[PDB]
């Protein structure tokens with residue numbers, strides 16, 4: 001096929017190898033925390049002390065699986081703070097040095113993250129592994145940047161859809177494999193996928209930013225440092241607005257508006273998506289195995305919609321499809337929030353899947369069309385960073401309201417707040 005097919009193919013297979021490696025360990029995390037608690041790990045005990053303080057503050061009942069999910073949520077949140085910190089820098093660096101050298105630095109970091117975990121099963125090794133993997137998770141935003149390097153709006157909108165399929169397939173099949181593996185072998189499979197991704201990208205990712213299109217600098221002074229690290233400067237896209245041939249006027253307002261909608265969407269969606277672990281236990285007494293089955297079906301529907309519908313939306317129709325998805329999430333979360341049987345829960349999950357499939361891909365696709373050739377890493381790095389900030393705060397704030405106000409209070413209120421990104425877009 002053309003050179004555009006070849007790059008997206010390499011980006012997709014690389015990213016799927018990456019996401020299998022990460023998601024593989026997620027169904028095992030409950031057992032690994034429980035092991036540390038049971039060995040009296042005094043560092044574990046520190047963090048358990050923090051989760052406890054939080055559990056007391058929000059009024060969360062004392063129960064093994066409620067603790068497991070809350071601890072997994074603090075851990076998930078700390079990790080997203082690392083992704084937020086590093087995504088703009090990694091982007092700006094690649095704008096200046098090319099996509100391939102920075103993609104490869106990031107993958108050596110991810111491979112090293114799994115080398116560490118492989119060697120030691122302590123809470124310390126766990127956090128050391130998460131820290132390194134966290135600061136090296138720019139490979140994700142570099143994938144979106146590489147798609148944004150492509151020539152046509154069509155190339156880009158389909159590229160972002162294909163990345164959507166990677167995340168949906170990765171988050172589906174990874175935990176499936178992990179729970180099928182003997183625990184000893186799991187960190188070895190993560191390593192195999194992470195080393196495979198590194199080697200695959202080394203041999204097959206073509207460069208999509210030529211030397212004569214690159215940003216002259218990463219950051220010259222403290223104001224440029226702050227442009228990559230301040231949540232408000234990342235919302236205002238100040239790093240992009242201060243680059244070579246940047247967007248200005250109406251074009252720069254639009255970029256900011258898509259970013260605010262992106263952040264708000266993911267703040268709300270990531271919160272309800274996390275607290276669905278509370279709702280399916282508390283209301284329907286789902287085992288974590290049954291939560292496995294449910295997220296599996298969600299991921300498969302999402303990959304189908306992403307591959308089949310999201311990927312076929314005519315360039316120019318991204319925004320119309322996002323507005324329709326944000327409206328669909330109002331009934332979707334009302335049905336989940338209030339449903340007292342599996343048919344009603346099921347209907348809300350189906351709408352959840354159709355709507356979530358479209359939003360991240362369609363918005364990335366429109367955002368990717370902004371910035372000059374040497375700013376694609378800074379634009380998509382800034383977008384990923386806003387998502388990371390959103391997935392950092394979303395779970396914690398939804399957990400507070402879920403336990404302080406109850407499932408209905410949280411799911412009704414978050415449902416209402418979806419009209420904020422809907423109206424910001426219209």
Ligand SMILES: CCCCCCCC/C=C\CCCCCCCC(=O)OC[C@H](O)CO
Nearest residue numbers: 039041112116120121122123124125128129
């Ligand atoms: C380019 C970089 C190359 C790679 C550089 C590697 C750096 C990794 C450093 C520290 C993490 C290792 C932590 C090892 C944990 C030691 C064991 C421990 O903490 O105690 C065991 C626990 O009490 C019960 O098993």
